[PDB]
Design a protein around this ligand. Structure first.
Ligand SMILES: Nc1ncnc2c1ncn2[C@@H]1O[C@H](COP(=O)(O)OP(=O)(O)O)[C@@H](O)[C@H]1O
Ligand SMILES: Nc1ncnc2c1ncn2[C@@H]1O[C@H](COP(=O)(O)OP(=O)(O)O)[C@@H](O)[C@H]1O
Ligand SMILES: Nc1ncnc2c1ncn2[C@@H]1O[C@H](COP(=O)(O)OP(=O)(O)O)[C@@H](O)[C@H]1O
Ligand SMILES: [Mg+2]
Ligand SMILES: [Mg+2]
Ligand SMILES: [Mg+2]
Ligand SMILES: [Mg+2]
Lengths: 147, 11, 105, 75, 535, 94, 46, 364, 526
């Protein structure tokens, strides 16, 4: 979303023109930011915060996959896996800060919807073991054995 | 109740 | 296709026609009613002319959104966010259909 | 409907209850069978101790409630 | 036969399976079916006394002590404070019948009770309940096919309302408004026919405003081809009657404009204060002049207004009302043919609604004033004003008129009718019995039980009218078999003949089909339940 | 309300725990009078429930004044009494 | 307020199960109170 | 208390007949003000007679009709027995007041309170044409301390409010004025805020506020006003510290927190026209008085008395004093009874003998 | 099987259910109890009841009104609730007839109980009662006499109707004077049905005969401080303006300046705006000014300096009554003085009533608004007098609206009962018995009227029945001595609307209660 002043944000309107143009200006700025992000080739955007409605609309307009991760540990692990840098602002990523993954897709395993960042190479910084089972306790025991 | 100008219950 | 329950129509909804033979549907996530422009927005004026101009500006913002929707050529308007009574009457006057607060799914 | 003052068990419930009572009685004394069997300590909540291996004595000293278990004890 | 399985072990150690299993009951097998059948039988036997023209009312009291004398089966069961789950299922059955059809919410309960009563003696003979349910479904299909066969169509045109009036009279005969029977039926028919999308489409009940005010007489109930409003003119010195009114419908309060956004208007000098005061005064005068420029003789507002606007409206000979509800605003603008205008600048002559007469109505020594708008050109919204000697009769007339409107709506949806008085039920039972004889032996018992359960409606009608149930039912069935005439029913009113076609006892085919279908499905659902696990 | 095979107050335990408890109770009984053996033994003071005082270093005299709940300790006390009655000496040794 | 001769009639025969359920516990307590009566206040004061 | 109406009101009687008797006493007090005890006795005796009348088998309707006939005859008899009275006959008024005061606690002090009551009623009415007396024109002030002998009839106005000004407690040839506005910092009805954006504006604001207050005080003083009564004000400070300091500096007595309900009484008493804006404050609206001083009640409190006026228009004040609160309350109730007796004499100019003579004549 | 007498329990804890005979018994007991409670307050010799409140207030209320009695009682029997609501609706529709309709419904339900005991289906009773009600309505309509044409005859009819209405109430002691008072008050309305235009002021002290109808109008408000206390040939301006710290309705406005001098200037501008408002009001050329809202100190001072009365805080009813009595227009803007009509009256002064001061209007121009002062020995007497006078005013207003009158004193009841009996004598079946019971209840009504007076009711009712069957259709009870007489000659008349409403409402409520065969009570909150 568009960053805001940390101290106190207050939109001051003194003429009808400013009132009639403020929302259009905000929408134009958001569209320009998202298009600048997309023009770098980034077809997947992962954020650790909330996603604004206009930001989601403009990401869907330019065919950008959006994934939201609440945990900062998950964000760090994803950065390690793909090879990206967690940008602090909404600037487009530089050539080195843009991670590359061989396949990102939405899939359903059993009754759970999952998002997979798949590498075709038999390497990588982080690997994942998906455990199946008929009981949560059984899978916890299998996880202990894996540990 | 409500609208003390007319002194009647509205809505 | 899709079917869902009627969602809290406002005044003037019964004027809108309830059958179309080739409608264009305007799927929106927009709150079409008069309201404060922003939560933290504040208007500071020192002239009654500016007061009237601000009121007219709010009304013109709402009617500009409604006019863009109308000129889009749609006949059925669906919005996830609430659609106000003013927008309902505006769409009724144009033989259009409106339905706000539609569930997201 | 019946308006009888008491409880009623019908069908598989009462049969399972009877079998459970008989099995409990059997498991009480199953550990004291054969030369490798072992005796039992019985205390009558007054301080009297009865070390015994006899099944009849064990079943006689115990106070039992279920009728089928009582049937096995009398057996 | 409760507390689940009370063992507590096989060895002696604790054996806890379900949380709080020592405070939970459980019914299994045939005992649960017997309990459910007995509960449904009790509910149906309570409800069957309110069936037919001679049925007696039931007098509910809620938890606050309010009294509701009613004959509507759905209303009776809705207000009943039941705890048994099968009773709640029967209440929901009545609610479903009321929602889909709006009439016959009592016959479904009696039919389900009779079906379960027969299923009880069928289960006593060792028949699996699923076999009973399958036989009931087959017999229900046969009965529905027979009902379609013996159905009769009626003309739903506005020119000839006689079949519609007869159907509404048949619906209202059981209700207490049978004193004003013909008048109530005619006003219900006219109300439905006025507001109805005539290409066999739906009827919107939001276009019918059923309002009741105590006092007067029940015969004073009338249909107003317009809108009646529970408000009055804002200024007490305004005229009480407006003729050939040109109504302006507005949703803007007659106050100086106020922006929605958080705004502060700064006054920095005496000149600014004078400018603000003049601006307020000229805004008042401007809004009044804008209203009067279109030529409107009457203004209607939704959000009320203040003293300056009130006196300007009185001074300019513009009677007005305030705080009219949103639904009432919509109804007024629909009836008068005018548009809803959100501000004065958008008000024009073409958006004015026309009404022949706008008057303020008094109600005796009660200080209450209510506004009526009528004599419109082609009003597409109607209201029903019910008068009575007490509020209980007002509520009962309201629900009776709702039943009549629902029946005429069903007639709009489908024009096929059948003749009531138990004639349809007797004919269906005869068809089911005939079909049973041409069927394998095992399901014959279920089919005949379904036929006997169908034959309970004429017996209930005979009992409620004082006649001997079995003798009258047998004679009517024998007459129906002798000469092919499925219109012979139970002469509840003692008119001397059993021909319901000659007696004009007419019911919609859809109502009977829904009754049979809902009763069969709920009887099957109740029969399939075999475990109860109340806490 | 509840249905049980045995009585409500009937408590049963079995297994290695019972053997461990019996042996521990016997060891505790032995430890009670362990230091009262030999020419250099020290006396003990016993307070009777009736108010009397028993001051002695005899095994049977000490053990007969102890009230215990574990039946193994009751067996050991009966053993002490048997040894005292049969021969009159060796009560702590047994 | 008329009909003081209620003659409850059918009422009890459909509820004597619960009535006897309460009465059994009432009697069970009753033996205890009657027994303790002969000591608790029979000769405490004197 | 000895007042029958007060006795019945104070005790919470529960029987409906007792409540109706209490209402009867209240009605007698409103219409007459005296005889509140005799009326209940008469009603009770009538009902007691009704008992034996009913026991003889007489319908209550017949009893009521006969009682109405007897009441009409009794009214005729009493009217015939009475004699005319003139308001110029002072001895008759004194006798009536003393008779009303005989049964009360102030019977030894009646020699003081009878002429006091007669004068209090006479000064507030016109003996030529008055047909009723508004007892609200007579203000009674209860001050603790002293003895009932210290009861005094003040011709002017007595104020319980203390003087805010210190060092000025006596003004001769006073020119009293009523103020219904506030002598504080300027403040409009609309939400007002003063925005400071520079260091000079601070001292500018302070200086301008001081100048505004000083101009207010100067305009007040220019009319010759030397005693100022300020109406009680809420949501705005009635008297600022600067205003009080300036008024003290210009030798003006200040009495603030004057109750709103007393404005009409004060205007009727001292002839002052209230002023709600400084524009209309002129010497014409001031009320001239001979003396306005604050007195001390021998350590039992302080009173402000404005005695002597150019236009003493139909208003008197009575100061009631006593040793304890109970005797003060009973004394003022008895004084009210005496005033009500004189008011009855003003209404209907007819006098009748007392001491049970009317009742014996009526019975016979 | 019953819903309650079943092996399974189908209800929540506390829910109840009464079947056919139990529900009928409860309904009949409640109805008979209500009827016997409300009766004995009926007829010229009816007595009053005391209503002690069980609440914290414990308010005392003695009354003869049936609706008042039935309203302030704790009713739990639902049929009794139905009858109470019937009485309330009857009171709302017309002033009189609450006791009559309640007693008629109770007697009808008693006859229904007897018929049910005689093994008669309730539907047959309902059909018979429908036919009987139709016949009685037709007979009563035929018996109506109209005197709306002749003015003096209509005035005599109004006087007779007011006397008949007030005969039962406490005002019967001064019935003649109170009849004149009520008739004059109603006729002063000039045909309008606005009963709120008639204000009743209750002042304690004085006899009930001291009550009077003021020739002008009386207001219970106060005049300003410096304004005159007496104006002759007053020009009245009624207003509904603020006049209290009057602020511009732009609620977003504020004063934001940088000095206290600017604040002082703004305050002076506010005071100048108020002064201009007062000047615009005064430009109408008025002597008195009545405002609905409060008047603050500055406008009060301006009016006092202008020599104009400023009566404040006269509520909506007050300003409406002043407009009706003087002819003024309730204004809220004063930019067009010549478009606003000014009220007028001959004299305004302050009067002394009891111990309170009131504003008196004399020589009013229009006078279509009455004020009545009530003087009584007790507050309960004042309340009962106000209720009785309200009943009389309501009945007189109804008679003015509809001039058809019918004879009272049991004449109308016996006439409709005779018609019902005539219809029943030529009807086969048990419907004849039901209609005979209907006629019996109609006879029972004047029987109760005579019972309350202690006369030989059986003989009087027999004589009335004989006279009405012979052909003397105007014979009624002569309560002065206890015989029968000619109601036309004696002068006991009632409004036809009141009697018709009583009959129809009683029959309707009896039919409503009779149709009930089962009462189901949900578990209460407590
Ligand atoms: N005039 C009549 N003659 C004979 N039977 C009638 C008549 N009117 C209604 N019935 C019968 O009474 C039954 C009950 O109808 P009603 O009580 O109006 O609604 P519900 O079906 O909800 O009980 C209907 O099945 C109908 O056959
Ligand atoms: N000095 C007196 N001598 C004889 N009788 C008196 C005297 N003063 C008062 N009375 C009588 O005492 C009665 C009661 O008067 P009082 O107690 O003052 O007031 P109330 O009439 O309210 O009781 C009066 O009716 C009066 O006739
Ligand atoms: N002077 C009279 N003579 C005979 N009957 C009267 C007289 N006045 C009233 N009635 C009768 O008393 C009945 C009851 O009137 P009332 O108790 O005053 O009010 P309500 O009609 O509310 O009961 C009326 O039906 C009327 O016929
Ligand atoms: Mg029906
Ligand atoms: Mg040794
Ligand atoms: Mg006295
Ligand atoms: Mg009356």
């Amino acid at each position: 979303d568009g960053m805001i002043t940390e101290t106190k944000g207050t939109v001051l309107i003194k003429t009808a023109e400013e009132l009639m143009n403020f929302s259009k200006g905000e929408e134009n700025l958001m569209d320009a930011q998202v298009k600048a992000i997309a023009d770098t080739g980034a077809n997947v955007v992962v954020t650790g915060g909330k996603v604004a409605d206009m930001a989601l609309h403009y990401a869907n307009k330019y065919n950008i996959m959006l994934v939201r991760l609440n945990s900062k540990w998950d964000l760090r692990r994803l950065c390690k896996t793909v090879g990206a840098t967690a940008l602090p602002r909404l600037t487009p990523p530089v050539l080195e800060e843009m991670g590359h993954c061989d396949s990102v897709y939405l899939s359903e395993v059993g009754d759970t919807q999952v998002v997979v960042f798949k590498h075709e190479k038999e390497d990588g910084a982080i690997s994942t073991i998906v455990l199946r089972g008929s009981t949560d306790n059984l899978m916890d025991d299998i996880e202990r054995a894996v540990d | 109740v409500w609208d003390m100008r007319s002194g009647q219950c509205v809505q | 296709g899709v079917a869902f329950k009627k969602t809290f129509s406002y005044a003037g909804f019964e004027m809108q026609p309830k059958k179309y033979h080739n409608p264009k549907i305007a799927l929106l996530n927009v709150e079409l009613e008069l309201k404060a422009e922003k939560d933290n927005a504040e208007i500071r004026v020192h002239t009654v002319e500016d007061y009237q101009a601000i009121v007219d500006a709010e009304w013109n913002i709402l009617y500009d959104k409604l006019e863009k929707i109308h000129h889009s050529g749609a006949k059925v308007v669906l919005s996830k966010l609430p659609i106000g009574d003013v927008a309902t009457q505006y769409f009724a006057d144009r033989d259009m259909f409106c339905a706000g607060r539609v569930p997201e799914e | 409907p019946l308006s009888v003052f008491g409880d009623r068990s019908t069908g598989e419930t009462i049969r399972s209850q009877n079998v459970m009572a008989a099995a409990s009685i059997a498991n009480i004394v199953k550990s004291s069978l054969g030369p490798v069997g072992l005796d039992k300590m019985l205390v009558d909540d007054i301080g009297d101790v009865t070390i015994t291996n006899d099944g009849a004595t064990i079943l006689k000293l115990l106070e039992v409630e279920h009728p089928a278990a009582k049937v096995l004890c009398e057996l | 036969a409760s507390m689940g399985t009370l063992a507590f072990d096989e060895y002696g150690r604790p054996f806890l399976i379900i949380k709080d299993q020592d405070r939970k009951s459980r019914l299994m097998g045939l005992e649960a079916l017997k309990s459910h059948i007995m509960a449904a039988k009790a509910v149906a036997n309570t409800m069957r006394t309110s069936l037919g023209p001679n049925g007696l009312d039931k007098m509910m009291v809620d938890k606050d002590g309010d009294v509701t004398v009613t004959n509507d089966g759905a209303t009776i069961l809705s207000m009943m404070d039941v705890d048994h789950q099968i009773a709640k299922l029967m209440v929901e059955l009545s609610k479903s019948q009321d929602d889909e059809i709006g009439d016959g919410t009592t016959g479904v309960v009696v039919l389900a009770g009779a079906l379960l009563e027969e299923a009880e003696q069928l289960l006593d003979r060792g028949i699996h309940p699923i076999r009973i349910a399958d036989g009931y479904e087959q017999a229900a299909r046969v009965a529905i096919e027979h009902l379609d066969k013996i159905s009769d169509s009626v003309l739903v045109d506005i020119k000839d309302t006689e079949p519609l009036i007869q159907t509404a009279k048949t619906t209202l005969g059981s209700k207490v408004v049978n004193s004003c029977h013909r008048q109530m039926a005619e006003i219900a028919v006219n109300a439905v026919l006025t507001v109805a999308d005539m290409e066999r489409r739906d009827v919107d009940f939001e276009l019918i405003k059923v309002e009741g005010k105590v006092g007067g007489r029940l015969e004073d109930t009338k249909l107003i081809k317009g809108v009646i409003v529970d408000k009055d003119f804002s200024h007490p010195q305004m005229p009480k009657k407006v003729e050939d009114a040109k109504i302006a419908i507005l949703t803007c309060p007659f106050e100086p404009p106020k922006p929605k956004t958080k705004h502060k208007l700064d006054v920095t000098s005496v000149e600014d204060y004078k400018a603000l005061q003049k601006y307020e005064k000229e805004k008042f005068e401007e809004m009044i002049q804008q209203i009067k420029e279109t030529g409107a003789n009457l203004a209607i507002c939704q959000w009320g207004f203040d003293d300056e606007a009130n006196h300007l409206l009185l001074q300019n000979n513009l009677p007005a009302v305030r705080w009219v509800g949103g639904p009432e605003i919509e109804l007024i603008a629909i009836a008068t043919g005018g548009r809803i205008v959100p501000r004065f600048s958008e008000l024009t002559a073409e958006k004015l609604g026309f009404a022949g007469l706008v008057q303020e109505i008094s109600f005796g020594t009660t200080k209450d004033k209510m506004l009526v708008i009528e004599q419109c050109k082609n009003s597409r919204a109607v209201t029903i004003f019910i008068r009575g000697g007490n509020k209980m009769i007002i509520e009962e007339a309201k629900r009776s008129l709702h039943d009549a409107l629902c029946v005429i709506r069903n007639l709009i949806r489908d024009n096929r009718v059948v003749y009531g008085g138990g004639a349809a039920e007797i004919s269906c039972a005869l068809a089911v019995s005939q079909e049973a004889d041409k069927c394998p032996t095992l399901e014959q018992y279920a089919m005949r039980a379904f036929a006997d359960a169908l034959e309970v409606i004429p017996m209930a009608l005979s009992e409620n009218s004082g006649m001997n149930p079995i003798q009258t039912m047998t004679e009517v069935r024998a007459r129906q078999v002798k000469e092919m005439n499925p219109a012979l029913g139970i002469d509840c009113l003692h008119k001397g003949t059993n021909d319901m076609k000659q007696q004009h006892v007419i019911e919609t085919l859809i109502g009977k089909k829904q009754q049979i279908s809902l009763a069969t499905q709920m009887v099957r659902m109740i029969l399939k339940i075999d475990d109860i696990r109340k806490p | 309300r509840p249905v049980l095979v045995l009585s409500q107050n009937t408590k049963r335990e079995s297994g290695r725990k019972v053997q461990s408890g019996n042996i521990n109770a016997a060891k505790t009984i032995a430890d009670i009078i362990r230091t009262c053996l030999g020419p250099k033994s020290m006396m003990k003071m016993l307070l009777d429930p009736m108010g009397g005082i028993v001051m002695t270093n005899d095994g049977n005299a000490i053990l007969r004044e102890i009230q215990v709940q574990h039946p193994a300790a009751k067996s050991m006390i009966e053993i002490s009494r048997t040894q005292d009655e049969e021969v009159g000496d060796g009560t702590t040794s047994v | 307020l008329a009909g003081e001769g209620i003659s409850v009639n059918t009422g009890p025969k459909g509820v004597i199960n619960d009535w006897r359920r309460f009465k059994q516990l009432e009697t069970e307590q009753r033996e205890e109170q009657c027994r303790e009566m002969e000591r608790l206040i029979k000769k405490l004061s004197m | 208390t000895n007042d029958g109406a007060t006795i019945l009101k104070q005790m919470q009687v529960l029987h409906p007949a007792a409540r109706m008797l209490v209402e009867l006493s209240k009605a007698q007090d409103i219409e007459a003000g005296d005889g509140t005890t005799s009326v209940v006795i008469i009603a009770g005796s009538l009902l007691d007679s009704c008992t034996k009348l009913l026991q003889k088998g007489i319908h209550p309707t017949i009893i009521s009709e006969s009682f109405q006939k007897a009441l009409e005859k009794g009214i005729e008899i009493l009217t015939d027995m009475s004699r005319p009275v003139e308001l110029s006959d002072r001895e008759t008024l004194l006798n009536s007041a003393t008779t009303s005061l005989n049964s009360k606690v102030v019977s030894q002090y009646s020699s003081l309170l009878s002429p006091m009551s007669v004068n209090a009623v006479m000064k507030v009415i016109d003996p030529a044409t008055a047909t009723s007396v508004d007892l609200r024109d007579i203000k009674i002030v209860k001050k603790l301390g002293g003895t009932i002998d210290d009861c005094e009839l003040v011709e002017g106005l007595v104020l319980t409010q203390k003087v805010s000004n210190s060092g000025i407690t006596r003004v001769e040839k006073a020119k009293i004025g009523l103020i219904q506005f506030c002598l504080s910092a300027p403040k409009t009805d609309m939400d007002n805020q003063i925005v400071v954006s520079d260091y000079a504006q601070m001292d500018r604001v302070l200086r301008e506020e001081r100048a505004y207050i000083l101009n207010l005080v100067k305009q007040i003083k220019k009319t010759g006003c030397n005693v100022l009564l300020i109406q009680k004000s809420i949501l705005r400070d009635a008297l600022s510290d600067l205003a009080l300091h300036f008024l003290n500096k210009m030798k003006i007595m200040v009495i603030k927190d004057i109750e709103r309900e007393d404005i009409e009484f004060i205007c009727k008493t001292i002839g002052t026209k209230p002023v709600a804006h400084i524009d209309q404050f002129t010497a014409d609206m001031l009320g001239s008085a001979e003396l306005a001083e604050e007195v001390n009640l021998n350590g039992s409190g302080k009173l402000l008395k404005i005695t002597g006026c150019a236009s003493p228009g139909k208003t008197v004040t009575i100061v009631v004093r006593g040793s304890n609160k109970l005797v003060i309350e009973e004394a003022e109730r008895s004084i009210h009874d005496a005033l009500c007796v004189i008011r009855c004499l003003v209404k209907k100019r007819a006098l009748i003998a007392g001491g049970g003579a009317p009742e014996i004549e009526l019975a016979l | 099987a019953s819903l309650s007498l079943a092996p399974v329990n189908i209800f929540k804890a506390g829910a109840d259910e009464e079947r056919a005979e139990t529900a009928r018994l409860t309904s009949f007991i409640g109805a008979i109890a209500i009827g016997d409670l409300v009766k004995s307050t009926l007829g010229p010799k009816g007595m009053d009841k005391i209503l002690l409140s069980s609440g914290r207030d414990a308010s005392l209320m003695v009354t003869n009104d049936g609706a008042t009695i039935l309203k302030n009682i704790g009713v739990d029997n639902p049929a009794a609730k139905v009858l109470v609501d019937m009485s309330r609706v009857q009171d709302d529709e017309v002033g009189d007839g609450t006791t009559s309709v309640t007693v008629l419904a109770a007697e009808l339900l008693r006859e229904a109980e007897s018929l049910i005991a005689k093994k008669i289906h309730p539907q047959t009773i309902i059909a018979g009662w429908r036919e009987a009600t139709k016949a009685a309505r037709e007979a009563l309509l035929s018996s109506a006499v109209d005197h709306g044409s002749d003015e003096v005859k209509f005035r005599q009819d109004l006087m007779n109707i007011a006397g008949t209405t007030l005969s039962s109430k406490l005002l019967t002691h001064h019935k003649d004077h109170f009849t004149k008072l009520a008739v004059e008050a109603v006729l002063r309305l000039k045909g309008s049905g606005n009963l709120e235009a008639i204000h009743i002021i209750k002042k304690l002290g004085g006899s009930l005969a001291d009550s009077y109808l003021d020739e002008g109008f009386l207001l219970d408000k106060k005049i300003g401080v410096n304004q005159p206390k007496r104006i002759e040939n007053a020009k009245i301006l009624i207003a509904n303006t603020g006049m209290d710290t009057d602020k511009i309705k732009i609620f977003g406005s504020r004063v934001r300046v940088d000095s206290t001098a600017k604040v002082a200037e703004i305050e002076h501008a506010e005071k100048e705006k108020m002064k201009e408002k007062v000047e615009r009001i005064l430009k109408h050329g008025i002597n008195c000014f009545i405002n609905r809202q409060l008047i603050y100190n500055y406008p009060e001072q301006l009016f006092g300096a202008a020599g104009v009365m400023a009566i404040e805080h006269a509520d909506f009813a007050g300003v409406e009554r002043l407009a009706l009595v003087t002819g003024g227009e309730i204004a809220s803007t004063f930019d067009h003085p010549e478009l606003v009509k000014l009220g007028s009256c001959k004299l305004i002064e302050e009067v002394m009533i009891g111990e309170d001061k009131l504003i008196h209007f004399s020589g009013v121009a229009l006078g279509e608004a009455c004020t009545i002062v009530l003087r009584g020995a007790t507050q309960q007497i004042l309340d009962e007098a106000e209720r009785s006078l309200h009943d009389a005013l309501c009945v007189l207003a109804q008679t003015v609206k509809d001039s058809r009158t019918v004879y009272g004193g049991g004449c109308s009841e016996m006439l409709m009962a005779h018609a019902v009996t005539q219809l029943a004598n030529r009807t086969p079946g048990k419907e004849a018995v039901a209609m005979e019971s209907y006629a019996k209840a109609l006879r029972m009504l004047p029987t109760i009227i005579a019972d309350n007076a202690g006369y030989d009711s059986a003989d009087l009712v027999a004589q009335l029945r004989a006279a009405h069957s012979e052909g003397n259709t105007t014979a009624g009870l002569d309560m002065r001595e206890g015989t029968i007489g000619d109601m036309a000659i004696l002068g006991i008349t009632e409004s036809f609307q009141v009697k018709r409403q009583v009959l129809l409402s009683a029959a309707e409520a009896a039919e409503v209660i009779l149709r009930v065969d089962n009462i189901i009570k949900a578990a209460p909150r407590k």
